[PDB]
Design a protein around this nucleic acid. Structure first.
Length: 313
RNA sequence: CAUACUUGAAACUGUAAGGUUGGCGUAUG
């Protein structure tokens, strides 16, 4: 086999938030699969069986059975018009992608935004046939693979955009990397088989984390327990809800404790009055930080945790 | 603007960056 592209590190699949235009810039880069709070990594690909100048583009695509251009935009470092374009130096063939944000289009602007993207892809020759429509492959980036779209082509895009918009999942997206190698003239037009990455799920997708603790009148208490607390939450079912206190131990252990209350203490599904559970060790000499969360007994759904401080008696 | 069926805005702050607020639509009054 000749030259090919290879993903060295996949983007992390979960925990990242897609951002809308109105939210402002720089809200954080897309993490790599091995990224950590101490050792931060990012998506990274490598060009194999070839060493020299090269162009690598990154497009956002769909997570269905048939890959298509996504309506969302890649924004941030080296990004323009929803596409990331970096060069792969003449010696180092490994490319990384830090400070990458996923710009979530609005439901109302999905169709027109998608139409604009397919067009840009058709004008630049960035995988038209694979991402827009089968009979558009004839548009290959020839130092500008048809810098001027014909009338019949805009029609194809229009039909494609409409058909592809009736079923686009705005909460999932994938990265597709495409490498181009210099031709006889030196223009990066030689295309290599693009490779798509794992799927990336929006942390703020509809129904992501439904349960939610808005505020608690107390965030600390005695290890002894039995202390009353007023918790304000989002909608909950009095008979299918509980307050879980947990602490992740040193080894693979996890201490658990439950707030004490009855269905009648759930006030209008938007608040709960309960008593704190006794802590793991009532003889600690220094305060112990733990976590508190709402949990549905039904399907074990939980809300994001909140810190709680247990102190000695 | 309030219900109903539903689901998704508008922002702000400002970063070894994230967090907080939290949502389009149809219909009915």
């Amino acid at each position: 086999g000749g030259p090919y592209l290879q993903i060295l590190e996949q983007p992390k699949q979960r925990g990242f938030r897609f951002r809308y235009v109105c939210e402002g810039p720089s809200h954080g880069g897309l993490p790599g699969a091995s990224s950590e709070k101490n050792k931060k990594s990012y998506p990274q690909v490598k060009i194999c069986n070839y060493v020299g100048p090269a162009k690598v583009i990154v497009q956002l695509v769909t997570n269905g059975k048939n890959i298509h251009l996504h309506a969302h935009s890649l924004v941030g470092k080296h990004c323009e018009d929803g596409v990331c374009t970096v060069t792969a130096g003449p010696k180092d063939m490994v490319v990384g992608f830090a400070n990458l944000g996923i710009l979530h289009v609005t439901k109302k602007k999905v169709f027109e935004t998608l139409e604009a993207r397919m067009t840009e892809a058709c004008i630049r020759g960035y995988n038209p046939g694979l991402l827009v429509h089968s009979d558009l492959a004839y548009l290959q980036a020839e130092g500008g693979g048809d810098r001027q779209l014909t009338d019949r082509e805009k029609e194809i895009i229009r039909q494609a955009a409409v058909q592809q918009t009736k079923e686009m999942d705005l909460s999932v997206v994938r990265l597709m990397f495409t490498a181009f190698l210099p031709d006889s003239t030196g223009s990066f037009t030689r295309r290599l088989e693009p490779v798509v990455s794992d799927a990336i799920y929006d942390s703020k997708a509809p129904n992501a984390s439904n349960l939610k603790i808005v505020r608690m009148d107390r965030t600390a208490g005695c290890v002894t327990g039995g202390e009353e607390i007023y918790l304000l939450c989002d909608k909950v079912q009095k008979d299918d809800i509980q307050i879980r206190f947990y602490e992740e131990e040193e080894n693979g252990g996890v201490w658990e404790g439950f707030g004490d209350f009855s269905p009648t203490d759930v006030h209008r599904q938007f608040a709960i009055v309960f008593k704190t559970p006794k802590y793991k060790d009532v003889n600690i000499t220094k305060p112990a930080s733990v976590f508190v969360q709402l949990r549905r007994k039904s399907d074990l759904e939980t809300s994001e945790p909140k810190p709680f401080l247990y102190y000695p008696e």
